[PDB]
Amino acid sequence: PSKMREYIAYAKTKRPVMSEAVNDYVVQAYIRLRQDSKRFSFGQATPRTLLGIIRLSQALAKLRLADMVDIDDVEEALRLVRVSKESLYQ
Amino acid sequence: RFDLVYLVLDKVDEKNDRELAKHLTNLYLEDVLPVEFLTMYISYAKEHIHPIITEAAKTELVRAYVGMRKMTATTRQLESMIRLAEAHAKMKLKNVVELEDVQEAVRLIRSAIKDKIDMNLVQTGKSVIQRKLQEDLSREIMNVLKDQASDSMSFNELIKQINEHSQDRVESSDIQEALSRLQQEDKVIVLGGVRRSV
């Protein structure tokens, strides 16, 4: 835990910035997530979930220590959300 | 009592959302907007500007309220139009209310309400139903007074006439409403669970 804390305090301050393929890609998921939310509980794709995918992808980018990161990252942020919804159903 | 009510709603709609998502993420990309001067502009407008109705505004305020009454408009709509048309003259700092300001005050209200005013949570297609339920109690008790050895029946046997085959499914709360308004008209007596004909 001490080495984990020491990693995180350093990982936080890097505040990664957007790369163009991230903003291009994230809409291509978000639109489909809206389109499937059109089609059973309350779990619809609000803009809070777009902001959420952004903040989650930022938290994964921090952990890998870079100024910015490719969408090999973003695809995992979408998996935490997708697994959460499948966990609401089961 | 509210001057305006907005349904702030949209569907899932790609031809909007393709823009909105691409707008929302547009904020993260870099290291006309009176960003403070607007609240100062508002403050100075509130300090300095005090509109008045012109005779050329009056003829339209009446005519539009008549049009909405012909179309469905309580006098609270006219009070809302008067105060909005003042604010839409205080905006532009104009100090004088005119036809060109009044027409936005309407168009904003039409965009709010049209986008009968549902008082008492009533609707025309539900108040006719309450009157049919009042008739349903009248007939249902008279025919039992004819065929059964009483003018009274247990509320269980009232739900087991009224709810089972008379009409599309009417819950006990609507029966109690119609029956209470019929106590006020004095055509049945409620005792304690017990109900008896006049």
DSSP state letters, B176-191: HHHHHHHHHTTSEEEE
Q: Which residues on A lie below 8 Å from B24 (Cβ)?
A: 47, 50-51
- Could you tell me where the DSSP H helices lie in chain A? 2-12, 20-37, 47-63, 74-89
Cα B51 to Cα B93: distance, rounded to the nearest angstrom: 9
Residue B78: exposure state from Cβ atoms within 10 A (0-12, 13-18, ≥19): middle
Subunit contact A30:B21, Cβ cutoff 8 A: yes
Subunit contact B28:A17, Cβ cutoff 8 A: yes
Token pair for A76: 């995992």
Under 8 Å between Cβ of B38 and B45: no
Q: Does A48 belong to an annotated binding site?
A: yes
Which residue matches tokens 């309350």?
A: A42
CB of A83 within 8 Å of a chain B CB? The answer is no
Cα A90 to Cα A43: distance, rounded to the nearest angstrom: 13
B9 three-state secondary structure: coil
Q: Which residues on A lie below 8 Å from B26 (Cβ)?
A: 23
Beta strands B188-191; B194-197: pairing state? antiparallel
Interface of B with A (CB under 8 A): 12, 14, 17-18, 20-22, 24-26, 28-29
Position A42, amino acid: F
Name which of B114, B143, B139, B132 is nearest B177 in CA terms. Answer: B132
B194 three-state secondary structure: strand
Token pair for A58: 């930022």
Helix count (H) and strand count (E) of chain B? 8, 3
Subunit contact A23:B26, Cβ cutoff 8 A: yes
Calculate the alpha carbon distances from B95 to B43, B45, B91 in Å. Answer: 15, 10, 9
Strands (E), chain B: 152-154, 188-191, 194-197
| Elucidated via | cryo-EM
Q: Which residues on B lie below 8 Å from A54 (Cβ)?
A: 25, 28
Under 8 Å between Cβ of B103 and B89: no
Q: Which residues contact A38 (CB under 8 A, 6 or more apart)?
A: B12
Query: Which of A27, A38, A50 is closest, CB to CB, to B18?
Result: A27
Cα B142 to Cα A45: distance, rounded to the nearest angstrom: 56
Calculate the alpha carbon distances from B158 to B34, B140, B161 in Å. Answer: 68, 9, 5
Q: Which residues on B lie below 8 Å from A56 (Cβ)?
A: none
Q: How far is CA A5 from the centre of its chain?
A: 22
